[model samples]
Target: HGLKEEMTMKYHMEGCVNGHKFVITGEGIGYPFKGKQTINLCVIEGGPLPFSEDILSAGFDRIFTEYPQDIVDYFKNSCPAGYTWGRSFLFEDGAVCICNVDITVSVKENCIYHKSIFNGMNFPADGPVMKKMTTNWEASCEKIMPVPKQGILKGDVSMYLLLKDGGRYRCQFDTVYKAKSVPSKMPEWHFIQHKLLREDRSDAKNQKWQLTEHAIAFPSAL
Candidate 1:
């Protein structure tokens, strides 16, 4: 069935072929009326227009009113749990690829795509649709290693240290920070410090330490 008048809006789809970007825009018309909507491909833009009349007639031409239910649902809401195979185009690079893209209806109802996505704005940090079943955000933290084990920090910093005893303690260290010191008569463990450097936070309290391996190795009893 055709979408109700209230359920349609101008939507855009963007894609790239041979490293060149192209955009397709659709404008809805009077629903349940006589005429149809307008869908354009790079009609209002400049530069090399890669889409020719033959290619469009072969695949790209379609009225939004004639779009499939799943496609309409995707434009109204988001795509459901499975793939919606529509059309594929060939590029100069000899790669045949599909043009299934995310779409935003309007601000009138409970839809999925937002203005931020259309504007290429990260207003919603996790908003972009990666695929038919994925988002731009990271998945669960499960099996993700903690920052300390990554060994990505530069210079000495104070942080939680992992001990062989399965206990974590705060210590000061460098590449192998504060590794010089093993508490007198304490169990020997392969020493490593844990620190997470969040660049988003203020730099006011960025701490630095200069303890060498020699001194802490045989320090006074503590």
Candidate 2:
């Protein structure tokens, strides 16, 4: 009665416990198939590689099924409302936010290891059970408060993660936030004629641009 001639053995519980691999097997899926219920063919793909919705949900519940009560509570309490707990925790219309967490917790025998999560790819549950969590953001806006007043274009916003133990990890970025604005007296025509067209002009005949005008030959506006 373990497995029938063609019965599928479903995943019950599978993960790590302090580097110890473990697997808990069950008979088969019956939530949607006991005797009178129907079994999904899942014929979209050729076979069982690509999981159907029922299988996916079952796997999710099974993974969390191993999580202790308070640990699950911690996951819920630490995360924001309407946010997914970790990787593979996607829900409709809900936001997903997870950071690279270095901390690991040991509760009794089992350990909880946070994995570097990327959607659409699966990773081995190496240390303990795997879950994923994003970077801490730092942002600000500034503008030149004088003469040709405009927001400081070269916005150098640096972000980093702050640890609870007074540790900070800085993140690097290549590009800077840039911006420009036209003064009250500066008409759109003037801006297009000057600022936008500044990149043009005698570029060794680099071809005409969108705002590049025949200013040199014009005599009246000169």
Candidate 3:
């Protein structure tokens, strides 16, 4: 029998969305598929824009672009200043690329004049010209941050949030140590010191930042 047979084709790939892919075409690159188009790129914007003073700025899809090692490290780990990773500071003056590191800061006070009986008691034991002068002083280092203006939070939580958000303008431990505290007061010795506190990484959590891998020193205070 020479009868013609008709066959129907059925498609089984249901509800499966095509995975995102890039296809560059110009005097440039080409896509893997031929005679068909692919997803070039996408953007996910958040935080801060042209109008508002909000923090976050923008986000871009992973495409043909490559990030510098520093940037990549920041993205993988928290930034040095303690802000979220994968964010850049877009200020009017300049665009600052950021990296993450945990830091410890100290607050110190300047020396203040105090009463020292040493001068009065030993006034001229050595010589008549040894006039007694009583002006002793002391200094101390007590780690504390200013009370937030709004008092959005009180203690550790607020500190953590500030550290997290302040990643752009990072804290410089050396500078903090150099600066003196508000009130100038001392109790016993000229160099009475405060307790040192440190933030520890949890053993259970995998470390996001690779200090040596990215070629940056550990946070100065650490």
Candidate 4:
């Protein structure tokens, strides 16, 4: 068909969109009559793009393009009974935040899901070094996003917490988490840790950061 040939020619040409250069590839398209008609536009080589920050940025579709299928399914499944998995953290500013997250599976309902009520804690950004700063902290999940095949759980949510001296810091950020398996009574439950999207936001003075990349060893039991 003329339309198909024209499309094929366009696919071979390099192009730019919204200030980003890209190339088109007809990788997934199969036999014309028996296949899906589609084209993939990928960021071209030598572009200003940095390393793959798929999980670090927003957009659920981008997550799928960068992650593996099995890993995504693992996050999709709920936590096993008798066990829960989550991450806890302490800041250099002396603020300590801890909370556990778990999932649930239902056969009768034929569904698996995450609960928002299970998310929240107190922000204690005080101590000998922090000058005794303490405040109530909580996170109300606005919506749960699917697992990025890359082992990062991305979500859109708001964090509510108070700073020392009644200063409150609240903001909505695209949340990301990397998951790992640990020896536990529940194999489905994994130890998930939060990650910051930007490198510059991890400073100790910036209390707005909800998660830290700094490693924290987990105990044998949840």
* Highest-TM-score candidate: 1
lDDT of each: 0.25, 0.21, 0.16, 0.28
Q: Which portions of model 3 show Cα errors greater than 4 Å?
A: 1-58, 66-85, 93-222
Cα error, candidate 3, residue 217 (Å): 27
Model 4 scores a C-alpha lDDT of 0.28
Clashing residue pairs, backbone N/CA/C < 3 A, model 2: 98-133, 98-134, 99-133, 99-134, 143-151
- Winner by TM-score between candidate 3 and candidate 1: 1
lDDT of 1 at 147: 26
Q: TM-score for all predictions?
A: 0.28, 0.16, 0.12, 0.24
Each prediction's RMSD over C-alphas, in Å, is 27.6, 29.4, 30.7, 18.6
Between candidates 1 and 4, name the one with more favorable lDDT: 4
Candidate 4, residues 1-222, lDDT tens digits: the string is 111211111112232322333332211121222211222323233233221212111110111111122223322222222123343333333333333433333323322222211121232323321232334344233333435344445444554444446754454544444344432122222322222222222234321112112111122244
Cα lDDT tens digits, model 3, 102-122, are 211111211111110000111
Candidate 1 per-residue lDDT over residues 142-193, each given as its tens digit: 1111124331112233333222344332322222111112212221122122
After TM-score superposition, the amount by which residue 96's alpha carbon in candidate 2 deviates from its true location, in angstroms, is 20
Off by over 4 Å in 2: 1-152, 163-166, 173-222
